[PDB]
Design a protein around this nucleic acid. Sequence first.
DNA 1: AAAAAA
DNA 2: AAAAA
DNA 3: AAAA
Lengths: 203, 217, 217, 216
Amino acid sequence: IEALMLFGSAARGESDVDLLAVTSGVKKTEQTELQFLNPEELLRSASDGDLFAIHLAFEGKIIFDTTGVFTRFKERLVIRKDYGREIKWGNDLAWYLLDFGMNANTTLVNKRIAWCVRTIAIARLVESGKIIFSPRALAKEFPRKHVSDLIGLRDEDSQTRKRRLAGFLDSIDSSRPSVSSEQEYVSHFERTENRVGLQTLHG
Amino acid sequence: SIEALMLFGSAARGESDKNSDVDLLAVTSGVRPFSKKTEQTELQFLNPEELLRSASDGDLFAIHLAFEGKIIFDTTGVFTRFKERLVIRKDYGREIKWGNDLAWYLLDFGMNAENTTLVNKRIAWCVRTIAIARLVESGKIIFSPRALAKEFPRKHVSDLIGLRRSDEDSQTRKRRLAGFLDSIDSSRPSVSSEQEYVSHFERTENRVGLQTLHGLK
Amino acid sequence: SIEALMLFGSAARGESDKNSDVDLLAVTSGVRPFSKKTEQTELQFLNPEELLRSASDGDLFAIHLAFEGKIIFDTTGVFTRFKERLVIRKDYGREIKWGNDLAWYLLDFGMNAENTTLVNKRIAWCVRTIAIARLVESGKIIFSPRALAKEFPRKHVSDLIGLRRSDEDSQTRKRRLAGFLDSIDSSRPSVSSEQEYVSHFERTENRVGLQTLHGLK
Amino acid sequence: IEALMLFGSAARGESDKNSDVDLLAVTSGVRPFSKKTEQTELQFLNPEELLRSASDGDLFAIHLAFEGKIIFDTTGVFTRFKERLVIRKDYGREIKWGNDLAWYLLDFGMNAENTTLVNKRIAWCVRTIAIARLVESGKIIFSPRALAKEFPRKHVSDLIGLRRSDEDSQTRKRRLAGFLDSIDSSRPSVSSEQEYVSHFERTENRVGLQTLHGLK
DNA sequence: AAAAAA
DNA sequence: AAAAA
DNA sequence: AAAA
Ligand SMILES: [Mn+2]
Ligand SMILES: [Mn+2]
Ligand SMILES: [Mn+2]
Ligand SMILES: [Mn+2]
């Protein structure tokens, strides 16, 4: 392991502990998340302006770095002109979770609703020039309908939170994709290369 | 009374030269901005309100702190509030014009000043400010001298940034700065005399330009 | 939930070689001690009461944490309270005896055990515990394998500590361990059989000896 | 500057009001000196002197080793520092230096012009005695609050609290005398200020000599 | 339920 | 040019 | 301040 970084909530001072380990030749406990990446993928995330890379660059705390990979990481970062692609992936998966998700692995569904909401909020705020990633600040700076409730779903309890997701979607004037069955969603996620929407759908 | 402390600059990046400074930012309430400098250390003091305001303004220096600063300690979370307040702008034309106008002043009146070290520091300030701003406008967050010269390859960028901690009084500095200004298609502001420059820096609120002149007297 | 996190071991020292692990200590309320391992990481959990007890008891591991550990975060000040409780002892004869007794067990009955990796790890533990304790007794705070071999230069110390990263059942380990034990003038405990060793470890409160017996199943 | 370390209260997470941020900068070719401001204190040392403080088991080096936070270290000097550290078996020399200076301050310093320096060095005497005796017992205590808890002699907290004070109260002398009595300190066999000076010279009490110099 | 890392 | 802790 |  050539470099180690603290990120997430523990890096902001406020509760999961998230650690990024960079290693060439490559997860979770009740309390910890240890994520591994090789240097090529770390730098690619910077070059492609991944929202996750923006978080690491502006909020990650370097524990050690023997090779200087985190400084090459930062000098490769290009914040993209727009994150419409990412916003659309979050919107589309949200509609799928609304239409066919409220009765699946309920743990994953709630985690994924929160992912949709956070992704849309992070992307719109990054577009406007912000570097906000914590749930608390996202809800303050992107005060759409039920944002606090939905981000808090990242929670294995199932109620009638279908109404909350629908309200959120209306307040950002989201349009459902032109799909009917769940099988239409599969081909839509495949066609739009919605990796998370695909990984989610089978789970 | 100092509620937070941050390492920034080359030492925060791990890329220190023989004659490189160690840059430290101390956040302490109830003071105006000032810096304590020794042989190899620069200690900058700022109060929290000024720090958060600089973030809200999208100051290029605030971006550097957010992107590269290493928090040594923070007892109040002020650096988290600082990052929440940051707004990276799309248009740094104001800061670019400030660096342009001061560069022209240094070209016209700086090359034979008594305080050679200040002129060189501020030539490099003009070039770095313009380079940093143009790259931020393109979605890049670049601050090291090496990457600035690579990513903003205008005429004499590397050797002019190299003047930042120099007492060189070479008469070639004029040609190099005029070459840089031509390569970015700079226009001299509608000014002639040194007093006219003062009013211009007053009128256009060029804080660093004003202080550079006061320093040179 | 984790109230504090600390880097320790080789990475905290800045001397991690090819086959190094990253060692992390998470201080977690309301858990008993346990660890989470990958090929390149070790994550140790302790609750605050147990962390402070190890300091009060002068555990050699606690000395390592206080002397070389790097605090990543500490929301409760538990590491400050830990260091205030530390009492470095003058006499580590108990621990030295625990290391000697377990080394004889492993020499006599460990060399063809199924769990070759655990045997090798615990041979290195015996040698390291003896070496660290003797050096602490002399006023030195030494934990790195390189410095332990230098400051406690007994037979095969470097080779045997290097077994902590080995799954190999080489025949050379028995001779080397015997050479080390001879070089410190060690003697077998009065234990007439392998089966009598669990009773001996029980009566002498050799926790690592008992745990090693448990894991060798 | 090849290495930089935070120490003192800020390294323990306790930097508050009226407390100073303490930084240690390692750089070549520099006699020990310190730059000080309202809220910071920047001590410079060369590598040879830093490692000597470890080899000699200086009480201050023990603080750096067990409580210092490394900000950066490009040469590994702090690792060679820690591997040189030898905690002495006895700190009687340091205890006597603090006792002797405390008596000098009691006898001749309680009315000096430089009240601030007297108060600072009273606290140094008390802190040095407390730290030294706790280190001899196997502890690594340096914060004022923990020193008063773990070395609970008479007035320890009041006297360490003089370290940032310009108080000239008459109570200081009686509190210092009480502290010295509670550790059964014996005053040096001197009868004059001139003889204190000769005593500090003979016993090589560098802080007692620097204090005397600074008071005049 | 679970260290024994250094 | 320490004496901080 | 104007450090980056
Ligand atoms: Mn979070
Ligand atoms: Mn720089
Ligand atoms: Mn090791
Ligand atoms: Mn203190």
